[PDB]
Design a protein around this ligand. Structure first.
Ligand SMILES: Cc1cn([C@H]2C[C@H](OP(=O)(O)O)[C@@H](COP(=O)(O)O)O2)c(=O)[nH]c1=O
Ligand SMILES: Cc1cn([C@H]2C[C@H](O)[C@@H](COP(=O)(O)O)O2)c(=O)[nH]c1=O
Ligand SMILES: Cc1cn([C@H]2C[C@H](O)[C@@H](COP(=O)(O)O)O2)c(=O)[nH]c1=O
Length: 557
């Protein structure tokens, strides 16, 4: 008569089983159990846009075994707990388990937790919740419209452009961003601008480096060899002196604990990890109960989490690193942080080196976020030389603050009015450089920025656009393929709304309204499908009627 606890993976089962008494029987479904696959089109999609979005879910291959294994486990249990992940997909999976197993809805509870620890599991089963149909509807809505775009747009692409090509509701918009970035880079015309550095000696022979900033009180920006040399000869004869000294106490505050998007960026910048790699390892860490749920865009930290880390900072770093009050970064979810701050990367049980480095990265950002600011004494020397003004910036670390948890890593003395002796002038030619190429994690950042992605879809978006001749990662950077641009233009021309960034961001909002009972999923899908078929209908017409242009290059005749 024990309770049945269902999770989606063996790894998560093992971890949660350590925190559930013998009264519970943990069992992983190891997969989605059930899911989707002119009536022909409807059957292929498994969803019917014409019959009020009636769906057709069938158990995945070899899962009928898992199904028949769960039912009998349920008949021996007084209650079934669906402990799927906390996001919508997880809710949907919980729904699929409750549907497939059957029985009284009262026999089912929906436990929510953002980390698999003793206390988090206790709090989750002490106040078990109900399955939220709206989050399930929100998830299915997303899924249904992705199926519609993919299965209804792709065919048009095969007929008009080339067979084998794919279309993705959000994938096509992600690609568009890369394609626009590609075109920016292709059209960019580098511009030449000069800079002039001056080496000088303070009264007491100390070396001081300055860069000219003003000439005639106007920004010094020579654009060629002659203008620079002309400025150089004026500068070689000028008398140098410190027009003014400015000593200001500055500080650098630690960043907020990680959320999905920032974790990916930092893992990509500091560890060279790609999005797929970071998310796969994040999941590994989360499922082993080492970090909080890795799909979040909430920077909140629970009081226990904050008090725990503050205890760590206090014992391991000291009073000077402990802020008076806990840092508050601005839902109900939490940031990606380690579950136990006292567990070090080196102490993780079965995690490969890279998974340890990701944890370490998460741990440090977490601890640092709750530490005091670093203090520096910033100095700004402004030097006058004839009609020129030169600058020298520098700072010395007074207190490392939060930087103490990061790996271990000089303007001379001079008073206002002191004369500087010129030693050498160094003119340097530079050129404005084209916009940086998106990186996997950098594209996500842009996606988030535009409210296009979502914690649990960012990674899927990145991968899903990568193996379809549209865009490719070369040296950890995105490059737009010819087909990518060809398709992106076709879609921009005949599926404007679908390709529009705001509308795409708005759809994410529309999905949030469904998840929050502020909109009905079918009506939302109806509206999406309405705008969609209208776009699609004109796209299918001959180009002479405003239809999509075939990817052809007609000869002279
Ligand atoms: C997570 C992490 C941060 N940091 C420091 C480097 C950055 O400071 P500087 O910009 O002053 O170099 C800052 C970046 O934080 P984020 O990774 O959150 O962006 O935190 C490390 O040195 N190593 C790490 O592994
Ligand atoms: C799994 C999944 C989750 N989510 C999200 C967004 C929110 O963080 C959370 C849903 O929670 P909410 O119902 O309380 O809004 O999960 C998506 O937007 N798409 C998905 O596919
Ligand atoms: C080209 C290159 C990028 N990167 C990174 C850092 C960032 O995570 C990402 C690109 O982001 P950025 O445009 O903000 O620099 O890829 C490396 O770590 N090494 C490299 O050699």
């Amino acid at each position: 008569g024990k309770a049945l606890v269902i999770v989606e993976s063996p790894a998560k089962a093992k971890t949660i089983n350590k925190y559930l008494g013998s009264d519970y029987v943990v069992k992983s479904s190891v997969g989605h159990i059930r899911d989707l696959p002119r009536g022909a089109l409807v059957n292929r999609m498994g969803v019917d846009p014409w019959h009020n979005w009636e769906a057709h879910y069938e158990v995945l291959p070899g899962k009928e075994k898992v199904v028949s294994e769960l039912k009998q486990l349920a008949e021996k249990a007084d209650h079934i707990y669906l402990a799927t992940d906390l996001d919508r997909e997880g809710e949907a999976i919980a729904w699929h388990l409750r549907e497939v197993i059957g029985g009284d809805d009262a026999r089912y509870s929906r436990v929510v937790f953002n980390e698999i620890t003793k206390n988090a599991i206790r709090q989750a089963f002490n106040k078990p919740g109900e399955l939220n149909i709206d989050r399930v509807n929100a998830q299915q809505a997303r899924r249904f419209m992705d199926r519609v775009v993919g299965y209804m747009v792709s065919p048009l692409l095969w007929k008009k452009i080339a067979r084998g090509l794919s279309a993705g509701r959000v994938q096509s918009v992600a690609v568009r961003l890369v394609v626009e970035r590609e075109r920016e880079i292709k059209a960019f015309v580098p511009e030449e601008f000069w800079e002039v550095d001056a080496s000088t000696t303070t009264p007491s022979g100390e070396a001081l480096a300055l860069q000219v900033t003003h000439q005639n009180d106007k920004p010094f920006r020579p654009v060629n060899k002659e203008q620079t040399q002309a400025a150089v000869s004026l500068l070689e004869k000028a008398r140098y002196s410190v027009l003014e000294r400015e000593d200001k106490p500055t500080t650098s505050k630690p960043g907020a604990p990680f959320i999905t998007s920032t974790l990916q960026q930092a893992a990509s910048t500091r560890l060279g990890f790609g999005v797929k790699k970071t998310m796969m390892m994040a999941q590994r860490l989360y499922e082993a109960g080492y970090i909080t749920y890795m799909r979040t865009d909430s920077t909140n930290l629970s009081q226990d989490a904050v008090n725990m880390v503050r205890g760590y900072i206090s014992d391991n770093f000291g009073k000077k690193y402990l802020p008076e009050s806990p840092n508050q970064y601005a839902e109900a979810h939490e940031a990606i942080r380690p579950s136990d701050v006292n567990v070090m990367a080196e102490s993780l049980k079965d995690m490969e080196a890279d998974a340890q480095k990701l944890y370490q990265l998460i741990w440090r950002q977490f601890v640092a976020c709750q530490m005091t600011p670093a203090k520096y004494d910033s100095t700004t020397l402004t030097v006058g030389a004839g009609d020129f003004r030169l600058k020298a910036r520098g700072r010395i670390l007074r207190f490392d603050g939060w930087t103490k948890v990061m790996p271990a890593l000089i303007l001379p003395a001079v008073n206002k009015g002191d004369a500087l002796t010129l030693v050498e002038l160094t003119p340097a030619q530079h050129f404005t450089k084209p916009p940086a190429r998106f990186s996997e994690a950098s594209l996500v950042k842009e996606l988030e920025k535009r409210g296009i992605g979502r914690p649990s879809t960012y990674a899927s978006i990145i991968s899903t656009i990568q193996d379809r001749g549209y865009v490719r990662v070369e040296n950890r950077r995105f490059y737009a393929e010819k087909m990518g641009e060809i398709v992106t233009d076709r879609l921009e021309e005949n599926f404007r709304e679908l390709m529009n960034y705001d509308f795409t961001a708005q759809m994410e909002n529309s999905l949030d309204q469904v998840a929050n009972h502020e909109a009905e999923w079918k009506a939302v899908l109806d509206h999406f499908f309405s705008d969609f078929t209208q776009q699609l209908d004109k796209a299918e017409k001959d180009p002479e009627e405003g239809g999509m242009r075939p990817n052809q290059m007609v000869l002279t005749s």
